[PDB]
Amino acid sequence: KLVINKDMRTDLFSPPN
Amino acid sequence: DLPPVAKAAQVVNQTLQLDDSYPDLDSYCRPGASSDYEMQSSDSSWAPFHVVRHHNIPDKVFEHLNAGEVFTKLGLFAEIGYAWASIDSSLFLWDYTHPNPELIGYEEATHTITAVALVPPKPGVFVKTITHVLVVATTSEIILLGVSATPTPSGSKSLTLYSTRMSVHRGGSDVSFIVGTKDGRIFLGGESDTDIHEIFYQQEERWFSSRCG
Amino acid sequence: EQGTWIELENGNRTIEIGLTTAPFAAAKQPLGFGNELAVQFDQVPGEFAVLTNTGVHIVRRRRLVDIFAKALGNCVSASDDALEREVRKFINQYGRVETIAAALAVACGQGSMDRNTENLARAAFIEYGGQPRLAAESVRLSSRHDALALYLTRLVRTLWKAKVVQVGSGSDISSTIPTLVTIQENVERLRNFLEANKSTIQGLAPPEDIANQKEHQALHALQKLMESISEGISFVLMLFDERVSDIYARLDAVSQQQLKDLTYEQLFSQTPGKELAKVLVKAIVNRNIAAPDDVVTFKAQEQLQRASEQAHNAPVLRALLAESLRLFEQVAGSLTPANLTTAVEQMISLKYYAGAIQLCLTVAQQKDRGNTALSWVNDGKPANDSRKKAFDERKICYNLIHQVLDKLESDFAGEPELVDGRPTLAATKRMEAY
Amino acid sequence: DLPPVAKAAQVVNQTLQLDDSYPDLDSYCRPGASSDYEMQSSDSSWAPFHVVRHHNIPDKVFEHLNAGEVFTKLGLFAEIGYAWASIDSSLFLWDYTHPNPELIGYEEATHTITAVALVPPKPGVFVKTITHVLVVATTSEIILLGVSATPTPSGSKSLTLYSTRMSVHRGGSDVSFIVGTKDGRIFLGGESDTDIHEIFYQQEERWFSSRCGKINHSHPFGSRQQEWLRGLYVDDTRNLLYSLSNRSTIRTYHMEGPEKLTKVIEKDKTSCLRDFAHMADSSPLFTDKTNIVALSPIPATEASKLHLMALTDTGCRLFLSATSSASYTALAPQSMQLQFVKFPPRESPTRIRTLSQLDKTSRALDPSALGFRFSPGYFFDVVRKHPNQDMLFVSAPDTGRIKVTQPASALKYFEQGTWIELENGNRTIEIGLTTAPFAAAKQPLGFGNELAVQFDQVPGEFAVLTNTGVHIVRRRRLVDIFAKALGNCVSASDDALEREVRKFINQYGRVETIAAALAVACGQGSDLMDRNTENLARAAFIEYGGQPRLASVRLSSRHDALALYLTRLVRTLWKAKVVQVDISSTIPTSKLVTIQENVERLRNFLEANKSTIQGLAPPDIANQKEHQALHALQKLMESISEGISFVLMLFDERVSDIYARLDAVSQQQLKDLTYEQLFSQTPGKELAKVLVKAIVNRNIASGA
Amino acid sequence: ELKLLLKSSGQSAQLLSHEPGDPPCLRRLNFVRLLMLYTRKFESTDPREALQYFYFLRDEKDSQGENMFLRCVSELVIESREFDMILGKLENDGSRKPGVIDKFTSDTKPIINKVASVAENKGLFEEAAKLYDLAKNADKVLELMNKLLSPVVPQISAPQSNKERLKNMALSIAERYRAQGISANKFVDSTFYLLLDLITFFDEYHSGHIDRAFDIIERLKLVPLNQESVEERVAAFRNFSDEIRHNLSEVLLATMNILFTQFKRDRDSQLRSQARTLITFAGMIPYRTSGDTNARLVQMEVLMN
Amino acid sequence: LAETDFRHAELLCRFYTTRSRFFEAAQVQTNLAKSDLNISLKDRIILLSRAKGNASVNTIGISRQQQQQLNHEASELLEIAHIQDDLLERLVADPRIPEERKAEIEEFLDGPIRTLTDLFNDYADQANYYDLCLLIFHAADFHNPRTILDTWNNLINQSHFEAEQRREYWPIAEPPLPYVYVSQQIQLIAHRTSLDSLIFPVNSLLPVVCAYAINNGQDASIGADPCWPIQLFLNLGVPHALVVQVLENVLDTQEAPFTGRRRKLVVQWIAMAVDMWVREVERRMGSWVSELLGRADQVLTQIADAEEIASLRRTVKGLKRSVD
Amino acid sequence: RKAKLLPMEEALLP
């Protein structure tokens, strides 16, 4: 079961908080 | 001028000549002295050597060692991966690479064993399946045994002993050191004096000589 | 010297120390003898059994590649300019070329996560390999190139100058079968690493200029040697996979004596070595018969050889013959006089006269489709002209046709053209041929 | 200040120099030794070589071979796809690529054939259509035959033979080895002695000199002990000739002139052993009992110092340097030294898949019977542990690891290796190269860069002749391995690809790996499921391409991969002149077409994924320069395609006619116009605008 | 042989006939059939003489293209089964004593494959191997030799058994294929020498030479013994010949039973660790009798602890 | 004790496997990898790898269906866990990623096995890890011919770039030519995919690789085997009968880059493929192959390297005989 | 079939 969702992710190249 | 694989073969030839021009011992140990060291911690990634494994002495010889009355001795046959222990007039070999080794014993000796060594055989004396000769020196005799260390089949060389009917009187001079040459010559020495003895042995029985001298 | 202290846990006394592996030797004379670096892929590292009263401890010599790999292992989690620091230690001791050669080796799986280490070694090989420059035309290649030549050389050093075979009367191979496989696997690993990084290795992809260009040329040359080394080894393994001395016994003397003093270097990088390889493969092909052009020619010889090995089954014999001819014709233009002659002779022996003739004509027409021969004869055959060659290659086919017809009238000398009324089989072959 | 195409051209120029800085052989085979291997199973996708097809010996050759009375022999003409078999005094050639070849028979010879070879012709002697000379040595004479090996529509040379009247009596010395130089010089040796002979021939007949002669270059005399040759080896790049003797003595000869041959080095096994003893690592694999079974010259294009590889029967590769006493008067060397040793691998071949010090004791290649090396280091070793079955060890340099290794002092001779099994009864006879000699550059630095030439020249292929047939072995490139590996990930998870990709990154680095994915995505390797593999390659290019970052910016690995791939597609063009003045084109038109197609397929790939690939669509300073950099590369691509189309248009007309009706300055500008200038510099554009304005003028005169 | 006999083009016609496009006053003889009848009489126990008559058909072919003489030799060998006499016996020493057909044509590669081809199609692998090996066609020899070995890999090699009679021929083909440097493609070839090693692994295992047998399996790197090698060994199993995957069940059990025996005789930790390795490998591999095997493997590991 | 102690669940699994209750062990090993217990990902890879083995062989008493029902579940997870592991390994070593985020990733990935959706979006696709994106499509039975092919194109290009940058730099050892590294990245998928038709469609991928071999000039110019795209797919296990079926489709359509005099290379591929096909039949196809080789000859005359073509025509006409 | 050997006249120039 795979579902691509380019819309809302988490910037892999920016730190958190 | 020259094709590709030919130019490369030239570099290879030159490179070969470079490696074969690595300095000889005489030229960096010239007359004089040196104290040049770079020391490395045992656990360092730069350590020139390190311990890789240890093999405990099997318990069945620890029992025999404490059963000793007068004399015991240990030794190594590193080239075939065997060790040995003598207890008085008894001898025991075992493969130290093996985890639960069988003891190969030789207890025919009548007197205390003082030296044992593993030596190449003399050519044209024994059948080809004999890889080595086992020299066993007691306080009374020097005994020769045939040995086959053929590689059955997985770790160390399976080992079998063969009698030879070759023995010489030990004489007055103790034997503590036995060495052998490429061609099977056997030399002896010890702690009674500086004399060097040699053991000859032959195939034939002759009326005027003996098989073993 | 490099030294260290080893403590075997207390209370045990050392008794003896003995060599468990084969005695070390990098060369056969004092010069080159002690070069551990040259043999770190040929020889097992020295192992030593240390006998104490509690047991036997095993001590192993560590090579350059072993030290380099473990050191890199300490740089995985560590920084970026920490690698540069660790590499410089190696450079200040072993030299730039030796250092980069070690990185190459570790990148190729040599050495004592292992993937991170190999990737780190690869990174060092790239970032620290230097570059080509011109001196004071003449160019000084990069340390990256020298490193590659150094690593490749050490993989093949045992066999490079060695004779390929040993002869007592028809027998042996100099270098053992299992070692040739490992040498091959090692070289193919190297080649693979180069392709798998064609993009990022500077000098591999196409290109001040003269420097980078001759760098590119030298690296290309090295890579052609590798595949040649791989082919060469693959060829020798094939030799001793077939019946070898059977070939040798049925050879010339120049062919027998060229094989005698054939070195691996010659096989790898010299024409006489390639030529002899061709001779040898050719022999084993025309014996199982006894490039789609060079492949077909072999199968054709195999078909024709099997035909002659028959009990004469019109179906099987005719099939083999018919197919043999079919194949030969497809490679007519490439057939050599030696292969054509043998083929025709074999067909003649099996009463395949027409077929033999048809092959000769076909070969003649294919070695000259411009009819340079027809014009050379129509011009009076002017000496010094270069159509003669074209005419000669047809004359060899025409002569062979004479032999066929000659052998035909000979084979059927005394045979009647008619028996009981209708034609015999000997008569029909005469008509079919003519 | 600097426009897009000029910015992208700067990246190309710097990328070209990076590929041409690939380490030279001397640099990673420095004095010392190595045992670095990564072994691969032959059935693995990571195998460096693999068998692609086999060609049986024709049955008619088997009939003749088993009809042999005294002597038979097989050999290879791999350069033209032919094999040969000699039976007593008869010779038979055939095209082994053909499925049902016809046998070219030659039976004029009167005595037993002992050697056969195919060499280049002497220039200015034969008609241009004669491509080779066939040398046939018997126990009584040597015979020269003209050869014309013209290619056919099928892809296999058509071979026709010509008589020459050129022959000489052999003499007392056996001939078993024949080698030819680039210039057509023919050298002979054999199993009677160590003497080297040369055959001369000329077109004109003279009253004082025959058309064909023979001389002994060794000039022997006095007392001579028994010793003969095992092989002869030529290196045209150094004008050298090497012989190997049965006592493992290596002799080097220098061709100081078109008719001279001078012995300049003689190095016996004792000398090699003395060098070996002076090395840090000595080994029981090389002793006075060891035999050298083969040599392989290393050309000057590949390495400056290392001249020669020597293979021992224990599987050790000995790499020897050679050096001249001086620097000026070709210059002949006078010394040869064993410098570097590559010791054998340890892994033996197995039916079932089995699971850092210098290894100098492995017996895996013992005994080595035959050995071959081809630039840039492809190594084939015939290991004959059992007397019925040969095992083939094949290895290549680990080009990917060598290219990434840093610093230069960490360079080692890393290799990828594999074992190819031949069936019971297959005895290997000879191995020869079937494709053009490998060369990624014209000098040692850059020479061995397999990665750079993945798309400019086909992978190397090698014909392995056995007593039963010819096996074709092909070198596998990174893109071949990457495509095959991805083909196994088609039926697996998102994490299955990431795992396989990490293997490639750890060996080749991220840029080279992503460049391989881009290439596979563009159809490279498909000349060999395929839509899914290309879609997986696309997924790898997107997901693992990285991103741009502040350190002046560091562009993503996705960008560097695109620049690397594009550069390698045009590396043969960039710095080359467009024309050669009767004016013609430097680059053949057929090559310009394939390059253009490759560039266009790359462009088509970027357009079809403008929405999914990061940086193509417009987007903070990092992603900005990422977009600008990628945009500049795409503008260079279209400019490259336009430039190539312009050159093709130009030579479709009559350029010499246009060149005549032209001013001097514009003739000179066209004389030294490079493809780089045409693609990325205004003067190329301005000149292009002049040429189009001139071709149409001429087109109107023809008025088609 | 005097170009006077009028042969019938079609081989499907009667013995005597008049071609449709010929004058009625002449007749034609189906010469091919004529000889075919005469031969069948003495072709069964007098092959040599039959070939002499088949030669006259060398100049003719059939509708399928085969050379009539070659086809007649194929049919005569398939029926008579006279291989040594007609084709030349290839001894187990590397010699090829020529046969009676060698006299008529030197290209004997096709028919030896023709005869080898049918005998292969009739499940006579042990013969097809000898025949293919006679023509030095290692691609087929090793292929068939892979099929004949896999069933017998774990079996007990006993005097005159089918294992000895096949192992001993395989080894006689391994030597002659190494001494002559012959080999098929690495897939067929790798599997062939791999089985030979396994056959040695069980011959040592069934003899009680546990130490020696353990060493062999370790070299092959077929079964992982340290947890680190599991990933790569598992991937290799995917592309190894099914003649190998078939015998994986017996290999794991023998290897386990090997460690099992050595345990009853630190070292204990090492065997325990290796025991685990075999299980995880077998757990990730779908293979023959994985049910009974995976269970037995786990039980033997429990008794160790 | 297995419920809260990993190293005790170890014995229970050993207890069952010495008794030969193999299914019951894989039943625990699988149920343990799916657990909420503090177990590293690389251990869960061992668990599922042992579970896959213990559930591959029959065990007395347990059905064949329940045996495969567990083997299939364990195999699926192992494929995913391998992706997740190879993903984390690459993300951590990725210079493009901040050291602050890498710790946030490692805690999330280095433990239980996440969904392919999580692995694809928040990680694999962002980093442009095209090779691992394909493995996810395969492991997810992802049905979409285009995106699969688009990802293959990006994977080939990014691979070509990394190899050309390396060759330009040479970088410790001589790096490989571009097509070699591209070939490696396909083999890595091919073995790992097990050659599923969905993510490895030769119908489309082989033209792409052959196109890349032209548009990026990976040919004889750089010393490469011109038929390296064919050699790649054949040796990977693709059927000969299919490769020739594709090259047939390429030679007729003449869609770029397979146009003009570049079709000379298409015939060379067809010769190599068919030649390797007859050599693989004679070691052990119909009219349509003969129709092609003859039609391939028109191309060589239509193109009439004057000697290369001439020699090639005689290699084609040789194969036409070998088939008829 | 014995290979047709075309003449020297064509072979060598001029």
Side-chain angles (χ1 to χ4, degrees), chain C residues 26-45:
Chain C
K28 301 207 133 188
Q29 64 286 329
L31 270 184
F33 182 84
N35 193 349
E36 294 183 283
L37 288 163
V39 293
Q40 43 193 336
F41 315 114
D42 277 324
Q43 249 159 315
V44 184

Side-chain angles (χ1 to χ4, degrees), chain C residues 14-65:
Chain C
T14 311
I15 292 170
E16 201 180 332
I17 294 177
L19 215 208
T20 60
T21 47
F24 179 100
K28 301 207 133 188
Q29 64 286 329
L31 270 184
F33 182 84
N35 193 349
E36 294 183 283
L37 288 163
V39 293
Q40 43 193 336
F41 315 114
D42 277 324
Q43 249 159 315
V44 184
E47 277 190 25
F48 311 89
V50 179
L51 176 63
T52 74
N53 57 324
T54 60
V56 174
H57 307 261
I58 300 298
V59 182
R60 200 185 270 146
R61 172 62 170 146
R62 293 170 89 260
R63 304 158 302 167
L64 205 215
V65 292

Side-chain angles (χ1 to χ4, degrees), chain D residues 387-590:
Chain D
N388 71 98
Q389 191 184 15
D390 290 351
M391 294 302 303
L392 232 67
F393 174 72
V394 197
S395 62
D398 195 337
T399 306
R401 195 177 312 277
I402 293 172
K403 179 172 178 292
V404 176
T405 296
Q406 224 65 53
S409 66
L411 280 168
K412 306 192 201 114
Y413 187 5
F414 304 108
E415 282 188 286
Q416 294 282 322
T418 187
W419 283 98
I420 291 167
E421 183 174 5
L422 304 175
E423 291 183 350
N424 165 250
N426 274 280
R427 186 181 205 80
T428 305
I429 294 169
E430 198 183 348
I431 299 176
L433 180 69
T434 70
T435 44
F438 179 96
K442 300 202 167 298
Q443 62 287 317
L445 274 174
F447 176 90
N449 195 344
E450 294 188 286
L451 299 164
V453 295
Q454 288 180 91
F455 323 108
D456 268 316
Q457 57 192 248
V458 295
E461 295 191 358
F462 313 86
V464 180
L465 173 67
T466 73
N467 59 329
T468 70
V470 176
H471 308 262
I472 306 298
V473 181
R474 177 181 296 155
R475 171 63 170 148
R476 286 173 85 147
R477 307 161 295 169
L478 169 58
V479 292
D480 303 311
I481 297 167
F482 192 77
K484 186 89 161 184
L486 263 52
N488 302 334
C489 295
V490 175
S491 297
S493 62
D494 203 327
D495 304 16
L497 177 66
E498 185 183 285
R499 196 232 314 288
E500 203 71 9
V501 164
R502 198 170 301 194
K503 305 178 183 178
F504 286 96
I505 293 173
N506 289 343
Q507 181 182 352
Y508 290 85
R510 192 172 301 271
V511 172
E512 290 284 350
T513 305
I514 297 297
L518 175 60
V520 173
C522 292
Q524 297 289 1
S526 179
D527 294 338
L528 276 294
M529 181 66 125
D530 282 324
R531 177 179 74 107
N532 288 320
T533 300
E534 293 176 7
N535 284 328
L536 256 177
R538 169 183 61 175
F541 183 75
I542 293 167
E543 290 285 312
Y544 314 113
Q547 61 181 21
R549 282 164 177 270
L550 294 175
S552 292
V553 180
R554 289 192 183 179
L555 300 171
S556 72
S557 299
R558 197 178 297 94
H559 165 275
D560 303 329
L562 177 62
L564 187 59
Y565 182 49
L566 174 59
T567 298
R568 290 169 172 175
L569 291 179
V570 302
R571 74 198 304 269
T572 63
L573 254 51
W574 198 253
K575 294 292 181 176
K577 304 294 188 186
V578 179
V579 298
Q580 294 290 329
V581 186
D582 185 273
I583 179 167
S584 64
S585 67
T586 312
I587 309 299
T589 61
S590 62

Side-chain angles (χ1 to χ4, degrees), chain C residues 63 124 148 179 181 272 295 337, chain D residues 28 96 105 179 358 365 406 419:
Chain C
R63 304 158 302 167
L148 228 174
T179 201
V181 170
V295 163
Chain D
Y28 67 84
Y96 63 77
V179 295
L358 180 66
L365 302 185
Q406 224 65 53
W419 283 98

